[PDB]
Design a protein around this ligand. Structure first.
Ligand SMILES: N#Cc1c(N)ncnc1-c1cnn(CCN2CCOCC2)c1
Length: 295
């Protein structure tokens, strides 16, 4: 008999994820079906999104050779029935307070920083880059969490040194770029560009660096369709473009510039979005989502 979720103590909530204490050395890392667009958690869940993203993260953890915080299999008996397939048993770590971001392509706040200053997180870039320009080598563009509801703040390497130590900062930079490079090459071979990604790491009892959180989901990474990669324009979000187009289209009745909470999504848009998640997962993993565990 699997325990109830109510047997565990809630310790943290994010926009679409939850964290529970299992015992002194283990946590339960829970993905929900909530989706975020335009910095709003939308009213409408995407069915199976939590399970699909958990499956994705597990696949990429298995692909990468680096130590990670997984502490049991996806069907570990400590996982409650209610969250089966969308929750993982993980080791409790001392988390390092750095959002470790790699960018293979220039977009979002990286592009904006570049357009304002010619530099991103201390990296002075070549002239003449623009939206969705390829960056080679990939850039380490660390950030720190800001206040509630606020965007992460881009920082330079010196800031990372000040947060975690000089040797550790070097390690975060090197591992972030190595891990991103491996995953991005794998995805591209399968027809998906991972344009960028965000990692968190923690440290175990021995002082060892351990990859934590979730890895290479479409929430932690910009997924693009490689077959439509066109430098110089904004690339479609592989997973979220239907949602974005509907919300800013004529049928939603919503004005994005108003910054009022957006309306619920059509069921059809939610189902189409689920399909995009499954497509991305199956193309990258070579597995069938119908084989992924659930309640
Ligand atoms: N992963 C991990 C982890 C760990 N293995 N040990 C200790 N702490 C953490 C931890 C603490 N906060 N967060 C991020 C934010 N949470 C994420 C999801 O739930 C919402 C909040 C990660």
């Amino acid at each position: 008999m699997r325990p109830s979720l109510s047997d565990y103590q809630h310790v943290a909530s994010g926009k679409v994820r939850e964290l529970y204490r299992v015992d002194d050395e283990h946590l339960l890392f829970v993905a929900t079906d909530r989706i975020s667009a335009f910095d709003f958690v939308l009213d409408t869940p995407i069915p199976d999104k939590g399970r699909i993203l958990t499956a994705m993260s597990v696949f990429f953890f298995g692909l990468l050779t680096v130590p990670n915080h997984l502490a049991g299999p996806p069907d570990d008996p400590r996982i409650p029935e209610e969250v089966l397939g969308r929750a993982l048993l993980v080791r409790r770590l001392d988390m390092l307070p750095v959002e470790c971001v790699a960018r293979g392509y220039l977009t979002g706040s990286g592009l904006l920083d570049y357009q304002r200053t010619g530099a991103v997180c201390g990296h002075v870039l070549p002239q003449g880059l623009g939206e969705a320009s390829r960056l080679d080598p990939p850039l380490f563009t660390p950030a720190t969490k800001a206040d509630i509801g606020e965007h992460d703040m881009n920082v330079d390497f010196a800031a990372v040194v000040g947060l975690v130590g000089a040797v550790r900062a070097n390690q975060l930079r090197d591992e972030t770029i190595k891990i991103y490079t491996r995953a991005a090459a794998h995805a591209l071979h399968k027809g998906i560009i991972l344009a960028d990604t965000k990692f968190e790491f923690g440290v175990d009892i021995e002082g060892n660096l351990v990859l934590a959180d979730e890895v290479f989901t479409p929430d932690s990474s910009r997924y693009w369709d490689a077959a439509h990669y066109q430098p110089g324009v904004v690339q479609d979000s592989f997973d979220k473009q239907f949602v974005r187009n509907w919300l800013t289209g004529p049928e939603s009745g919503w004005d994005r510039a108003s910054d009022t909470p957006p309306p619920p999504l059509p069921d059809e848009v939610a189902v189409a979005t689920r399909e995009r998640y499954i497509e991305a997962y199956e193309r990258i993993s070579g597995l069938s989502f119908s084989d992924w565990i659930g309640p």
